[PDB]
Design an enzyme around this catalytic site. Structure first.
Site, PDB file in Angstrom:
ATOM      1  N   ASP A 158      -3.868  -4.053 -10.937  1.00 29.18           N
ATOM      2  CA  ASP A 158      -3.230  -2.716 -10.658  1.00 29.18           C
ATOM      3  C   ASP A 158      -1.859  -2.440 -11.811  1.00 29.18           C
ATOM      4  OD1 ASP A 158      -3.042  -0.335  -9.312  1.00 29.18           O
ATOM      5  OD2 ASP A 158      -1.890  -1.192  -7.768  1.00 29.18           O
ATOM      6  N   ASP A 185      -9.858  -7.461  -0.540  1.00 31.94           N
ATOM      7  CA  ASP A 185     -11.123  -7.157   0.388  1.00 31.94           C
ATOM      8  C   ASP A 185     -10.597  -6.229   1.517  1.00 31.94           C
ATOM      9  OD1 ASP A 185     -12.446  -8.834  -1.480  1.00 31.94           O
ATOM     10  OD2 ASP A 185     -12.678 -10.396   0.244  1.00 31.94           O
TER      11      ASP A 185
HETATM   12  N1  LIG Z   1      11.074  -4.810  -5.942  1.00 30.07           N
HETATM   13  C1  LIG Z   1      11.154  -3.269  -5.968  1.00 30.07           C
HETATM   14  N2  LIG Z   1      12.494  -2.746  -6.337  1.00 30.07           N
HETATM   15  C2  LIG Z   1      12.637  -1.521  -6.252  1.00 30.07           C
HETATM   16  N3  LIG Z   1      11.795  -0.407  -6.322  1.00 30.07           N
HETATM   17  C3  LIG Z   1      10.516  -0.960  -5.746  1.00 30.07           C
HETATM   18  C4  LIG Z   1      10.233  -2.150  -5.670  1.00 30.07           C
HETATM   19  N4  LIG Z   1       8.755  -2.217  -5.227  1.00 30.07           N
HETATM   20  C5  LIG Z   1       8.432  -1.172  -5.398  1.00 30.07           C
HETATM   21  N5  LIG Z   1       9.290  -0.271  -5.775  1.00 30.07           N
HETATM   22  C6  LIG Z   1       9.288   1.156  -5.871  1.00 30.07           C
HETATM   23  O1  LIG Z   1       8.292   1.718  -4.698  1.00 30.07           O
HETATM   24  C7  LIG Z   1       7.434   2.641  -5.337  1.00 30.07           C
HETATM   25  C8  LIG Z   1       6.059   2.672  -4.499  1.00 30.07           C
HETATM   26  O2  LIG Z   1       5.692   1.389  -4.612  1.00 30.07           O
HETATM   27  P1  LIG Z   1       3.910   1.258  -4.353  1.00 30.07           P
HETATM   28  O3  LIG Z   1       4.022   1.483  -2.607  1.00 30.07           O
HETATM   29  O4  LIG Z   1       3.560   0.033  -4.732  1.00 30.07           O
HETATM   30  O5  LIG Z   1       3.304   2.399  -4.936  1.00 30.07           O
HETATM   31  P2  LIG Z   1       2.303   2.621  -6.198  1.00 30.07           P
HETATM   32  O6  LIG Z   1       2.883   1.551  -6.878  1.00 30.07           O
HETATM   33  O7  LIG Z   1       2.416   3.670  -6.529  1.00 30.07           O
HETATM   34  N6  LIG Z   1       0.929   1.824  -5.716  1.00 30.07           N
HETATM   35  P3  LIG Z   1       0.245   0.310  -5.697  1.00 30.07           P
HETATM   36  O8  LIG Z   1       1.184  -0.763  -6.398  1.00 30.07           O
HETATM   37  O9  LIG Z   1      -0.841   0.184  -6.145  1.00 30.07           O
HETATM   38  O10 LIG Z   1       0.031   0.064  -4.092  1.00 30.07           O
HETATM   39  C9  LIG Z   1       7.228   1.857  -6.800  1.00 30.07           C
HETATM   40  O11 LIG Z   1       6.649   2.581  -7.622  1.00 30.07           O
HETATM   41  C10 LIG Z   1       8.768   1.878  -7.207  1.00 30.07           C
HETATM   42  O12 LIG Z   1       9.371   2.781  -7.732  1.00 30.07           O
HETATM   43  C1  LIG Z   2       6.264  -9.949  -5.337  1.00 26.89           C
HETATM   44  O1  LIG Z   2       5.619  -9.497  -6.146  1.00 26.89           O
HETATM   45  C2  LIG Z   2       4.429  -8.749  -5.672  1.00 26.89           C
HETATM   46  C3  LIG Z   2       3.123  -9.398  -5.712  1.00 26.89           C
HETATM   47  C4  LIG Z   2       2.101  -8.596  -5.380  1.00 26.89           C
HETATM   48  C5  LIG Z   2       2.336  -7.501  -4.298  1.00 26.89           C
HETATM   49  N1  LIG Z   2       1.596  -6.697  -3.636  1.00 26.89           N
HETATM   50  C6  LIG Z   2       0.313  -6.997  -2.967  1.00 26.89           C
HETATM   51  O2  LIG Z   2      -0.321  -8.225  -3.231  1.00 26.89           O
HETATM   52  C7  LIG Z   2      -0.066  -6.203  -2.173  1.00 26.89           C
HETATM   53  C8  LIG Z   2      -1.157  -5.091  -2.969  1.00 26.89           C
HETATM   54  S1  LIG Z   2      -1.668  -5.363  -4.827  1.00 26.89           S
HETATM   55  C9  LIG Z   2      -2.309  -4.018  -5.265  1.00 26.89           C
HETATM   56  C10 LIG Z   2      -1.710  -2.590  -4.880  1.00 26.89           C
HETATM   57  N2  LIG Z   2      -0.443  -3.079  -3.796  1.00 26.89           N
HETATM   58  C11 LIG Z   2      -0.638  -3.724  -2.710  1.00 26.89           C
HETATM   59  O3  LIG Z   2      -0.478  -3.093  -1.609  1.00 26.89           O
HETATM   60  C12 LIG Z   2       3.790  -7.034  -4.195  1.00 26.89           C
HETATM   61  C13 LIG Z   2       4.733  -7.842  -4.962  1.00 26.89           C
END
Ligand SMILES: Nc1ncnc2c1ncn2[C@@H]1O[C@H](COP(=O)(O)OP(=O)(O)NP(=O)(O)O)[C@@H](O)[C@H]1O
Ligand SMILES: COc1ccc(NC(=O)C[C@@H]2SCCNC2=O)cc1
Ligand SMILES: [Mg+2]
Length: 299
Positions: A158, A185
């Site tokens: 991803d 999955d």
């Molecule tokens: N550890 C973190 N610290 C700060 N911001 C964060 C962190 N993890 C996620 N975010 C923010 O949260 C947003 C939304 O995350 P997320 O729900 O994973 O959506 P996405 O990245 O667009 N899709 P996906 O990763 O495929 O599930 C991210 O794009 C970051 O801007």
């Molecule tokens: C701590 O470092 C991370 C490692 C993995 C994950 N996320 C996941 O395993 C959940 C899935 S992976 C693809 C889209 N995003 C998800 O919801 C988050 C932080």
């Protein structure tokens, strides 16, 4: 603490940062829903929502990702078990991890809070990200993918600007990689043409995703509209290219090698690490922290 981090390259600055995160993590044991206080929402995607939270027992601020899953308790427990591997993923290029647990229909993944957010959030404010900054991003992404593949035999699956996090110390780290086969999955496109058509996941698909992400961040827009039209373009039309003149020949060649349609002809991580764009970017003195703090108004 008896650090066993000699297997990692680690310059003194990277060594100090990683030991500091791991030292703070020692304040964190079992994670439970009642031990958190929500501060604000960091962002959200199709799969979940991420909150900036206070962990009351430790006093640490963390990023808590909540993924709604109300499935058979035994397979939800297999996901939680698989997520525990995140406790072994210690690298300067991978977001720090505090723990994962299940509570009332939601899987929580608790991470190091990255105060610069993701590169899709910084792209909104920057407009376009300069080539020299993208050189540092490319090094971090290649190094993060190499670490996950070599040490843990995991492919990211991803890669996109929302999954590349940054902070005020100028660190660049990956998040949301496929550590759990069972979570995969149970759960704009950056998918490679072969992944869109139905082909077993390869490191090569992550390289395509990185290539496309770099083009988007360089030009300030998704470089490829209806859903069939977009996927048909990825599969059946030439890959996008950076505009000539505005970008160096090394950067154009680097993205071109990531975006080759045939995955066997497309560059591999070993080839990318020694590409002229990477060798040039690694030698450059770039104040990434200064650029980031100025661009998004962080201190
Ligand atoms: N550890 C973190 N610290 C700060 N911001 C964060 C962190 N993890 C996620 N975010 C923010 O949260 C947003 C939304 O995350 P997320 O729900 O994973 O959506 P996405 O990245 O667009 N899709 P996906 O990763 O495929 O599930 C991210 O794009 C970051 O801007
Ligand atoms: C701590 O470092 C991370 C490692 C993995 C994950 N996320 C996941 O395993 C959940 C899935 S992976 C693809 C889209 N995003 C998800 O919801 C988050 C932080
Ligand atoms: Mg994400």
């Amino acid at each position: 603490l008896y650090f066993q981090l000699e297997e990692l390259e680690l310059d003194e600055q990277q060594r100090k940062r990683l030991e500091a995160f791991l030292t703070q993590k020692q304040k964190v044991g079992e994670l439970k829903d009642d031990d958190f206080e929500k501060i604000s929402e960091l962002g959200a995607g199709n799969g979940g929502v991420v909150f900036k939270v206070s962990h009351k027992p430790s006093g640490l601020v963390m990023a808590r990702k909540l993924i709604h899953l109300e499935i058979k308790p035994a397979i939800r427990n297999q996901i939680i078990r698989e997520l525990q591997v995140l406790h072994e993923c210690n690298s300067p290029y991978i977001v720090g991890f505090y723990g994962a647990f299940y509570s009332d229909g939601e899987i929580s993944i608790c991470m190091e809070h990255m105060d610069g957010g993701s590169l899709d959030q910084v792209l909104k404010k920057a407009g376009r990200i300069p080539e020299q900054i993208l050189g540092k991003v490319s090094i971090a992404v290649i190094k993060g993918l190499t670490y996950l593949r070599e040490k843990h035999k995991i492919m990211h699956r991803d890669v996109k600007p929302s999954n590349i996090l940054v902070n005020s110390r100028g660190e660049i780290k990956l998040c949301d990689f496929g550590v759990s086969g069972q979570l995969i999955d149970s759960m704009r496109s950056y998918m490679s043409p072969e992944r869109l058509q139905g082909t077993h996941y390869s490191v090569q698909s992550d390289i395509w995703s990185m290539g496309l992400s770099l083009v988007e961040m360089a030009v300030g827009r998704y470089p490829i509209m209806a859903i069939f039209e977009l996927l048909d373009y990825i599969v059946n039309e030439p890959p996008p290219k950076l505009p000539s003149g505005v970008f160096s020949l090394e950067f154009q060649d680097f993205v071109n090698k990531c975006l080759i349609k045939n995955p066997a002809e497309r560059a591999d991580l070993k080839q990318l690490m020694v590409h002229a764009f990477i060798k040039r970017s690694d030698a450059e003195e770039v104040d990434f922290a200064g650029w980031l703090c100025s661009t998004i108004g962080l201190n």
